[PDB]
Amino acid sequence: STIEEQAKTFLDKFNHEAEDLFYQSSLASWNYNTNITEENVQNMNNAGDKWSAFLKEQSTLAQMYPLQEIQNLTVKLQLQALQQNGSSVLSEDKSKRLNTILNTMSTIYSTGKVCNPDNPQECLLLEPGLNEIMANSLDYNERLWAWESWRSEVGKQLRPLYEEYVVLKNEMARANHYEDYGDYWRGDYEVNGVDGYDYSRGQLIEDVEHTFEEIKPLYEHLHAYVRAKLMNAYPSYISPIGCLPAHLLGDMWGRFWTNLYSLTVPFGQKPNIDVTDAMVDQAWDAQRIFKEAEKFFVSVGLPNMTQGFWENSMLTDPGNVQKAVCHPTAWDLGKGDFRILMCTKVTMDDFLTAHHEMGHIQYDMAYAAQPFLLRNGANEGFHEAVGEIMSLSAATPKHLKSIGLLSPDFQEDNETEINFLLKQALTIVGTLPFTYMLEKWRWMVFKGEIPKDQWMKKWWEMKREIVGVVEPVPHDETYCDPASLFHVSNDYSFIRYYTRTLYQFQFQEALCQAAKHEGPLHKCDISNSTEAGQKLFNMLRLGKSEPWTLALENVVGAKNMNVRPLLNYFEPLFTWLKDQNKNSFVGWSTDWSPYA
Amino acid sequence: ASVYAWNRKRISNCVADYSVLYNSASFSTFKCYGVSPTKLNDLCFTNVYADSFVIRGDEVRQIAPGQTGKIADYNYKLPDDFTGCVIAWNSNNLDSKVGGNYNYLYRLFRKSNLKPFERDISTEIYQAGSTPCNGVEGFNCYFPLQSYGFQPTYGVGYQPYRVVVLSFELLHAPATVCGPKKSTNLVKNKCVNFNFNGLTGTGVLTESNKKFLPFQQFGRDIADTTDAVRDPQTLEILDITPCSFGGV
Ligand SMILES: *[C@@H]1O[C@H](CO)[C@@H](O)[C@H](O)[C@H]1NC(C)=O
Ligand SMILES: *[C@@H]1O[C@H](CO)[C@@H](O)[C@H](O)[C@H]1NC(C)=O
Ligand SMILES: *[C@@H]1O[C@H](CO)[C@@H](O)[C@H](O)[C@H]1NC(C)=O
Ligand SMILES: *[C@@H]1O[C@H](CO)[C@@H](O)[C@H](O)[C@H]1NC(C)=O
Ligand SMILES: *[C@@H]1O[C@H](CO)[C@@H](O)[C@H](O)[C@H]1NC(C)=O
């Protein structure tokens, strides 16, 4: 007789049918991804279209139960995700045009090649090709050539498509009662209907700026040290006062600076933390890696993995004709079916990536008791930070001596910690200005503050303002330089990587406060302390059933995103950089001094 | 059977070996709520009702007195005064199908809770609103029966578990189901304590020349003392001489 019981019966019916169809869709996606076959592609398309049609029909049926008369907050959380119309609010021809634009942008991004002008004889794709020449090569001219060629090709091929994608997504979000598509992207962090714990979606652009104004001295010192060190390899191309060129940052886009560590190592004469020689001399295997990682998880107090995880995962390259997508992906197919698809070899990087993917699997296991709408992360940063907890903890020398892998008399002096914290800085605090810059640029573009004839001018100035990187040659609006990245060309929100990089240090600080670690935060280990695992599992089991402010406050005691754990993590590195930059020009002004 | 249409089998006039059932290690769950296996071997019961169905692994805990859940409310309700056993084992090697075994249904929506040991195979459309269904599916009218997936790649808690519930009961009737009688070897010509078909005593059991008629089991003298008996295992007649006590 009431709206509550009708909504609860509708949600039970949707949960059972959606779990069934989502298991079918995820099994089809798994069968496609571990074994590329055109029949598997057709099965995956059929299952995805069945799930899309089912979700559209239940989104149509969910509008009849109004949210204004519902008092239960979990029913509100389950029904807001259903009553969102999405792209179906448009006309059929506009939705078809938007989907066609998305698929053609994906195919043109995937099918790029690095063939030289006037030398078309042979080339590769980006992953065997451009990754090697931009990450590992020490030459200036070939890096500049590959960079300019790829940005030029993707710019002419995607500048109309990305412009029309912006226009259609803006019309979609204005039709769906949001201000812009960036405002739609900030709806994942929105909390409403809870007094005190509520979080406006316009408060995210305040908190991100507030945390970046305290990131920015550490990034200025890191940029000054990198600029001072990189003149040894590039003497005439880099000015001592101006900004860095774009193609020398150890990546295609400068997203991760982690390949610049070999060029900027502080103390090369010290022995390294690289355990790969002892890992291959002890004859490790992928099963041994996952067993030691599962021992690491059960030492913290999280439950061990099911027999279906061991019997169904793909932990090795299957063979000759069974090609697989070698990217590390943790799969939650639902109904207790957790598995990892990751091609492995004996490597410390694959060890840490296995810890990352089993962190994702454990987080999928923890909210498995929740209903189907609430089986996701509290926001889009939680689900990627929970694996990075394991990635930070598994890299420590205490953990690598716990499993007997690192040598027991390896001494943790000052230099062997500074040159590890610098690698962690290039991995973590190097991606914060690029992420905040790119998402600020996308929010201003989708908001309409930047016209189409000022996209690139505003972007490179913003790059000069935030990241401290100048263009190698001057570019104009004939190119679309940011859209060459994987996430922006495939309709992925990208600010998830900013809050992840802050939440991982908040959670680890809380879980190092719980584990009673006396020493520094970078030497802290989560292992052997069940009281840290209970603190973590009290938040991992909630899912979307609770606001992310309350789930954050359950761990760290603060109901907002905070930046102080990241600063006091890098405090010995920050003091060493402040004592190192006695006479170098710390920071920068925006300039064209290294190149006009 | 499926749990909305669970099979009930009436068991009477037989001897039941629960020790093979208990000693079988294949059963993942063996909960008895008013009996013990030794008690099951030593209690004679009038009726044994075997209720059989397939559920998930998570639903196994709902098969108990005083439990609440979709199986325990809308499919199979056990009373609070239940005297019986619940036996459950994983049937992934038989029930699961690689394309999905949709053949095992369960009732998701019902107007009211079940009475204990009620069964309701009716496919009446659940009317959750004031709007009438008129049989057809609508925005508030749902089909009450839903299919289990039962794929072999499911995790534990979604894997299919075959459950058999045995209900034992004593009525105002002669009880006939009773546990395995463990007869020992027969020793003759010695003063032993004999227990022959419920007739107990102490005596020397020797061979007898008294030829019983086939319906007769025991033998009495003038003084109404059992001096002849028939062995139930092998149909032979034994004299019961009292043990040779005397005055000192
Ligand atoms: C992978 O697909 C090929 C294509 O026919 C098939 O022959 C092979 O059996 C498949 N392997 C698995 C493990 O499904
Ligand atoms: C919503 O309803 C369920 C079931 O009736 C109840 O257990 C839960 O506490 C309710 N939630 C709120 C926030 O009232
Ligand atoms: C998980 O740990 C429990 C606790 O000891 C153990 O009984 C079980 O066999 C373990 N599972 C696996 C797959 O090792
Ligand atoms: C955890 O405790 C076990 C048992 O004493 C020990 O072998 C292991 O080295 C400990 N690990 C750490 C990191 O202290
Ligand atoms: C009972 O079992 C005994 C065991 O030797 C057998 O000899 C006999 O034929 C059976 N039947 C009867 C009625 O005694």
Residue numbers in the entry:
A (entry chain D): 19 to 614
B (entry chain A): 348 to 595
What does the paper say about this structure?
The most prominent mutations are in the spike protein, which mediates entry of the virus into cells by engaging with the angiotensin converting enzyme 2 (ACE2) receptor. Despite being phylogenetically distinct, a common feature of both the UK and South African variants is the mutation of residue 501 in the RBD from Asn to Tyr (N501Y). X-ray crystallography and cryo-electron microscopy (cryo-EM) structural studies have identified N501 as a key residue in the spike protein at the interface between RBD and ACE2 that is involved in critical contacts with several ACE2 residues. Mutations that emerge in the receptor binding domain (RBD) of the spike protein are especially of interest given their high potential to alter the kinetics and strength of the interaction of the virus with target cells.
Cryo-EM structural analysis of the complex formed between the N501Y spike protein ectodomain and the ACE2 receptor ectodomain provides a detailed glimpse of both the overall structure of the receptor and the binding interface between the RBD and ACE2. The ACE2 receptor is bound to the “up” position of the RBD. The overall structure of the complex was determined at a global resolution of 2.9 Å. We present a 2.9-Å resolution cryo-electron microscopy (cryo-EM) structure of the complex between the ACE2 receptor and N501Y spike protein ectodomains that shows Y501 inserted into a cavity at the binding interface near Y41 of ACE2. This additional interaction provides a structural explanation for the increased ACE2 affinity of the N501Y mutant, and likely contributes to its increased infectivity. ACE2 binding has been observed only to RBDs in the up position, likely because of steric constraints in accommodating ACE2 in the down conformation. However, the stoichiometry of ACE2 binding to the trimeric spike can be variable. Negative stain experiments show that populations of spike proteins with 1, 2, or 3 ACE2 receptors bound are obtained, and consistent with the binding studies, we find that a higher number of ACE2 receptors bind N501Y spikes as compared to unmutated spikes when the incubation is carried out under similar conditions. To investigate whether the N501Y mutation increases the binding strength of the SARS-CoV-2 spike to ACE2, we measured the binding parameters between ACE2 and either unmutated or N501Y spike protein ectodomain trimers via biolayer interferometry (BLI). This revealed that the N501Y mutation confers a modest increase in affinity for ACE2, mainly driven by a reduction in the dissociation rate constant (koff). Our structural studies establish the molecular basis underpinning the observed increase in ACE2 binding efficiency conferred by the N501Y mutation.
